[PDB]
Structure 1
Amino acid sequence: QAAPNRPNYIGFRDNFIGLMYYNSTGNMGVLAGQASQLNAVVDLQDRN
């Protein structure tokens, strides 16, 4: 006897949440002026 394989949809996450990671400090993005290079974005660890 043969039963068909269980269906699975390996697609992207909804809204790509998990493709990009801020709010886990260390490897987060900066947005700074070129002349200053001090970020306007620092995250907190417990901030979704």
Structure 2
Amino acid sequence: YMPTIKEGNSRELMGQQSMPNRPNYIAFRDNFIGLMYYNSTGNMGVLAGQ
């Protein structure tokens, strides 16, 4: 809650209220899904006799 848009310390800004920011849990996906390319003609896993 910003009592007044003006900057600089003053009487109005004294009454401001704050709350914590929402949490995020960014991490690697389950089973590392998506790290390896699957089912794309552009990038196809190759395994063959040399």
Stretches of structure 1 lacking an aligned partner (at least 5 in a row): 35-48
| Counterpart in the other structure of 1:5 | 21
Q: Over the residues paired in the alignment, what is the CA RMSD in angstroms? A: 0.8
Shift of 1:18: 0.6
Residue identity (%)? 91
Q: Give runs of ≥4 in structure 1 deviating > 6 Å.
A: none
1:14 partnered with 2:30: yes
Structure having greater relative contact order (Cα 8 Å, sep ≥ 6): 1
Larger radius of gyration: 2
What's the TM-score once normalised by structure 2's chain length? 0.62
Stretches of structure 2 lacking an aligned partner (at least 5 in a row): 1-16
What is the rounded CA distance, in whole Å, between the counterparts of 1:14 and 1:32 in structure 2? 29
What's the TM-score once normalised by structure 1's chain length? 0.64
